[PDB]
Amino acid sequence: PQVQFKLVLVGDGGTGKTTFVKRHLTGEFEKKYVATLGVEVHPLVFHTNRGPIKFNVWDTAGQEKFGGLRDGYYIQAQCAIIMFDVTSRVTYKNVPNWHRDLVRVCENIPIVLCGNKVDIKDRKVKAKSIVFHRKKNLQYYDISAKSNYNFEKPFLWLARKLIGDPNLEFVAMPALAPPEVVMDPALAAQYEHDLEVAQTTALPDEDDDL
Amino acid sequence: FEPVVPLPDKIEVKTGEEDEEEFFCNRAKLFRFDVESKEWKERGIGNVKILRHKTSGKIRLLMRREQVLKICANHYISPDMKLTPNAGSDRSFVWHALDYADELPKPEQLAIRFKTPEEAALFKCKFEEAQSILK
Ligand SMILES: Nc1nc2c(ncn2[C@@H]2O[C@H](COP(=O)(O)OP(=O)(O)NP(=O)(O)O)[C@@H](O)[C@H]2O)c(=O)[nH]1
Ligand SMILES: [Mg+2]
Known about the structure:
The complex is a heterodimer.
Chain A: E1 3-11, H1 17-26, E2 39-48, E3 51-60, H2 70-73, E4 79-85, H3 89-93, H4 95-106, E5 111-116, H5 132-135, E6 139-142, H6 153-163, H7 188-200
Parallel strand pairs in A: 1-3, 1-4, 4-5, 5-6
Antiparallel strand pairs in A: 2-3
Chain B: E1 20-34, E2 39-53, E3 59-64, E4 71-76, E5 84-85, E6 92-99, E7 106-113, H1 117-131
Antiparallel strand pairs in B: 1-2, 1-7, 2-3, 3-4, 5-6, 6-7
The structure holds phosphoaminophosphonic acid-guanylate ester and magnesium ion (MG).
The site of phosphoaminophosphonic acid-guanylate ester has 25 residues of chain A, from helix 1.
């Protein structure tokens, strides 16, 4: 047994839902726009002072062509994230539509509203304009899947509501002992080849993140 | 909102490093090579550490992402590893390891970068000092 929660991630296309999920999953930042086809379910595990918790994130597609499948996606949903893009007013304009269709199927589930891409200077949806969370008593967060600004707070807020512990803490992941090294000769060549290609390929541009 | 699952008990929170001493600790950015896409992918930013167990003497490299505090590198340092500069850089290294960051043994080509060449040089120094007293 383990503590699992189904989370449905919804929002207009291009708001960064998948990039947000992959940043948590592997730490990567995908710059390319590879639209999701239907839905992809990704497990995200967080470590708390009450043990590990797993969010089975249903990363749904924002394209309208999948609108007829969303009620099936939202089946057995225990929590949700509604995503919009602070550089695209239309994505915020649609937030009420995502919320309406969610609560028709789910009714009383914890829901977090996220305004993504706050790392971009030319912000179009100002904090003053964001009023829908006050309208539907939702939790809101400015986030950035690129700079990681607040990108963990949605899961922390939802985990507290789902667990019933308002003071649940995300703690350092226990560093278990890694496997021993056999240093076998046969498999070495394959890794040596993979390592030369990696050494030749240049690393990403130096950022001010460091 | 009412809870959905029973309230799991509090656990004794441990980092997993209590029985180890730090030979090195410094902020860095980690990368992992995706041979399918043939591109480096950001793996995590935070403190990379070299840890020696106080009784067994085994030494490992451990790195945590900021904010999430999740593990992005965890592998024992072996004498076969060799820190190799990436593209004539004086601030970054590449090497191969059987990593356990996801708690599954994965062979990975990793790259680590530091803000300054001095930080990178100290890392190489301690990484290779560990390789000389491996137990
Ligand atoms: N600057 C910036 N770009 C971001 C951010 N998050 C995502 N992006 C970019 O936005 C684009 C679309 O992201 P993606 O995750 O595919 O969007 P989506 O919401 O999953 N789209 P869909 O519903 O069609 O699957 C990508 O080029 C990605 O790099 C962010 O926080 N900042
Ligand atoms: Mg997507």
